[model samples]
Target: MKSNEHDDCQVTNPSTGHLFDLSSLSGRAGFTAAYAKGWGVYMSICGENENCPPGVGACFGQTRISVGKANKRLRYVDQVLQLVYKDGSPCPSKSGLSYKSVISFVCRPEAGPTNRPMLISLDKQTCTLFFSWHTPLACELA
Candidate 1:
């Protein structure tokens, strides 16, 4: 097993207390497990331009609502992440409930002060860190 630090392929979510490793064989399983463990909510963070399919895809657990390049049509950064709303359901729902998810982030320009870090949220616990996005970015989790 590799130490948590010095591993470039995987990044741990301090908020959700989940670790996502694109290079690990068990990575997908861990991702899904975390997603399933959550109550009606699933979230994930990925490398920049990870080439996730448009509109629909599966990662870190349940089915997702793709929007980065499908609807927003904008490439914001080298890394990307998302949160989806689905409870034992698939994307593009069939039972009249449209699944929704939010993918929002904050970044700094090329030139900025390095001392000050952009505070994303108030919660100190790693679990439910997704709410941090809502705190700073005002992104609602469907």
Candidate 2:
């Protein structure tokens, strides 16, 4: 069966606090929704930052994290080894469930108050990685 619920998303900058719903746009919309319905922000985390649409108005300034989130001491973890590291065998999983994987995430610009940073969570969704960095190609001299 198909559901009519829109994908969950967060709002930008929320002034009022509300229970953030993925379906809700974000703070402003909720602000209008609540104001139209005669209410204030719900709680600390209102609707999803999917704001600007019409319903959500709390999750703004969220969404994807920033690029600067990288460049620091902490870097993105490589999850590729997780699949085959179990048996330490170069052959296969033997269970016949070994599948190729890709690793990547979205890192937005680092400026203003839009410093939203978070690891791409692939818990229950299709995952794809886009590589945009390069090293010295292991320039080691004998």
Work out how many backbone clashes candidate 2 has: 33
Each candidate's TM vs. the true structure?
A: 0.24, 0.16
- Which is the leading candidate under TM-score? 1
TM-score of 1: 0.24
The residue-by-residue lDDT of candidate 2 on 1-142, one tens digit each, is: 6466343332222334332222221232322112233332221112222332323222112231111110111122341101100111122324432211121222322233322212233221222111221221111111
Error of 1 at 105 (Å): 0.9
Q: How many backbone clashes does candidate 1 have?
A: 9
Off by over 4 Å in 2: 1-61, 65-125
lDDT of 1 at 5: 28
lDDT of 1 at 137: 21
